[PDB]
Write an enzyme that holds these catalytic residues in place. Sequence first.
Site, short mmCIF file in Angstrom:
data_model
loop_
_atom_site.label_atom_id
_atom_site.label_comp_id
_atom_site.label_asym_id
_atom_site.label_seq_id
_atom_site.Cartn_x
_atom_site.Cartn_y
_atom_site.Cartn_z
N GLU A 263 -158.69 -25.17 -46.66
CA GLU A 263 -158.22 -26.52 -46.96
C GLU A 263 -156.81 -26.52 -47.53
OE1 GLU A 263 -161.01 -28.53 -49.41
OE2 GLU A 263 -160.56 -30.44 -48.42
N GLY A 264 -156.02 -27.55 -47.22
CA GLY A 264 -154.63 -27.63 -47.69
C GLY A 264 -153.96 -28.97 -47.45
N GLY B 46 -154.52 -29.97 -43.76
CA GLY B 46 -155.82 -30.56 -43.47
C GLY B 46 -156.90 -29.54 -43.77
N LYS C 52 -170.67 -21.08 -31.74
CA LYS C 52 -169.97 -21.17 -33.01
C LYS C 52 -168.50 -21.33 -32.76
CE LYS C 52 -170.72 -21.56 -37.25
NZ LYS C 52 -171.93 -22.30 -37.72
N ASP D 6 -143.53 -20.87 -34.95
CA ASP D 6 -144.10 -20.48 -36.25
C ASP D 6 -144.86 -19.14 -36.10
OD1 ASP D 6 -144.63 -20.83 -39.03
OD2 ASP D 6 -146.48 -21.91 -38.61
N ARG E 124 -149.79 -14.27 -40.09
CA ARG E 124 -150.83 -15.23 -40.50
C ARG E 124 -151.31 -16.18 -39.36
NH1 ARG E 124 -145.89 -16.68 -42.66
NH2 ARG E 124 -145.10 -18.61 -41.64
N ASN E 125 -150.50 -16.30 -38.30
CA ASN E 125 -150.81 -17.14 -37.14
C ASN E 125 -151.24 -16.35 -35.92
OD1 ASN E 125 -150.25 -19.58 -38.58
ND2 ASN E 125 -148.07 -19.30 -38.19
N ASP F 265 -151.85 -21.08 -33.45
CA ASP F 265 -151.16 -22.11 -34.26
C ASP F 265 -149.75 -22.54 -33.80
OD1 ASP F 265 -150.87 -23.74 -36.68
OD2 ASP F 265 -152.66 -22.58 -37.27
C1 LIG Z 1 -156.53 -21.09 -35.32
C2 LIG Z 1 -157.43 -21.34 -36.52
C3 LIG Z 1 -158.92 -21.10 -36.23
C4 LIG Z 1 -159.17 -19.75 -35.58
N1 LIG Z 1 -160.54 -19.28 -35.77
C5 LIG Z 1 -161.05 -18.87 -36.95
N2 LIG Z 1 -162.30 -18.39 -36.93
C6 LIG Z 1 -162.84 -17.97 -38.07
C7 LIG Z 1 -162.14 -18.03 -39.28
C8 LIG Z 1 -162.37 -17.70 -40.65
C9 LIG Z 1 -163.61 -17.12 -41.19
C10 LIG Z 1 -164.45 -16.38 -40.36
C11 LIG Z 1 -165.62 -15.83 -40.85
C12 LIG Z 1 -165.99 -16.00 -42.18
C13 LIG Z 1 -167.27 -15.40 -42.71
N3 LIG Z 1 -167.49 -14.00 -42.28
C14 LIG Z 1 -166.36 -13.12 -42.62
C15 LIG Z 1 -166.69 -11.68 -42.27
N4 LIG Z 1 -166.99 -11.55 -40.85
C16 LIG Z 1 -167.29 -10.16 -40.50
C17 LIG Z 1 -168.12 -12.43 -40.52
C18 LIG Z 1 -167.80 -13.86 -40.86
C19 LIG Z 1 -165.15 -16.74 -43.01
C20 LIG Z 1 -163.97 -17.29 -42.52
C21 LIG Z 1 -161.23 -18.02 -41.35
N5 LIG Z 1 -160.30 -18.54 -40.46
C22 LIG Z 1 -158.97 -18.98 -40.89
C23 LIG Z 1 -157.91 -17.91 -40.63
C24 LIG Z 1 -156.56 -18.38 -41.16
C25 LIG Z 1 -156.17 -19.70 -40.55
O1 LIG Z 1 -154.93 -20.11 -41.11
C26 LIG Z 1 -157.22 -20.78 -40.78
C27 LIG Z 1 -158.60 -20.34 -40.30
C28 LIG Z 1 -160.84 -18.56 -39.18
N6 LIG Z 1 -160.27 -18.98 -38.04
#
Ligand SMILES: CCCCNc1ncc2c(-c3ccc(CN4CCN(C)CC4)cc3)cn([C@H]3CC[C@H](O)CC3)c2n1
Length: 270
Positions: free
Chosen positions: A28-29, A32, A48, A151, A155-156, A169
């Site tokens: 969150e930020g 959005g 998922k 960008d 991180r992207n 992104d």
């Molecule tokens: C293009 C943006 C979306 C791209 N897809 C996507 N899919 C997933 C995530 C997660 C995320 C995934 C899993 C977990 C829990 N376990 C963690 C350990 N693991 C082995 C099993 C699962 C918690 C968070 C964080 N992000 C963020 C990254 C940084 C970005 O800025 C904003 C989204 C994710 N983004």
Amino acid sequence: SHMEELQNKLEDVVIDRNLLILGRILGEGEFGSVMEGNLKQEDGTSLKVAVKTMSQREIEEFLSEAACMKDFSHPNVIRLLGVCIEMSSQGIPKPMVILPFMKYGDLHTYLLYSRLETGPRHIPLQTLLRFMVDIALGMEYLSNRNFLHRDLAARNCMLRDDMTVCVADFPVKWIAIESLADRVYTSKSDVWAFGVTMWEIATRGMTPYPGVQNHEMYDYLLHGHRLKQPEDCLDELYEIMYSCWRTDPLDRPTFSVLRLQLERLLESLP
Ligand SMILES: CCCCNc1ncc2c(-c3ccc(CN4CCN(C)CC4)cc3)cn([C@H]3CC[C@H](O)CC3)c2n1
Ligand SMILES: [Cl-]
Ligand SMILES: [Cl-]
Ligand SMILES: [Cl-]
Ligand SMILES: [Cl-]
């Protein structure tokens, strides 16, 4: 026709709000939110997913841009699964982007965690270079269809379940000398950002230009200073990243040239 194609893509990008359920907030930020979701697929089963949540002009702009992004199809570019537009109780439009759920998360965070005992193991040289080749491949695809990222940073970039990196992104210390100056921005500006991203990877997640403050950046580059070579980074890898920051954009290599340079280097390792 050009109008024809855009109508098709618009048709293909939208997702029925019925086919989606939203779950917990992952992040969150001021941007959005990112939430977990399930997407019901044409085959009857659920997938998922990750859901990023953010004038009618602004909405149409979003839709048109989303339409183009869904049309990208490359293993090293993130697949946009579609969009939903919901509305808030204040009547403000709430556009949602649907993306794959990637359990390993963004590449930057992954690098940092590899330096902690419970995170991923130590990442060898070969794998760090592989990550760079993947990003170059995705960027080679995009520039070849004249799309500017704007960008590009670790991180992207996202890690997929098979450890493939994809660009996603579509940040003063990532911005090329001339886009600081003119606000002028080419794919050679993206090349600059790619070199910085390569440096982030080779330092396992350091912030660029330690010691230098954001307000000092333009003057630092103006006097010809660049990112320093990381410890235990091959000289030839450094040469490649340094080529990305050549003062004159036309002297920088294309992503195609970079990508082959990086593949050769990788090939040469034991
Ligand atoms: C293009 C943006 C979306 C791209 N897809 C996507 N899919 C997933 C995530 C997660 C995320 C995934 C899993 C977990 C829990 N376990 C963690 C350990 N693991 C082995 C099993 C699962 C918690 C968070 C964080 N992000 C963020 C990254 C940084 C970005 O800025 C904003 C989204 C994710 N983004
Ligand atoms: Cl829901
Ligand atoms: Cl993907
Ligand atoms: Cl650090
Ligand atoms: Cl530096």
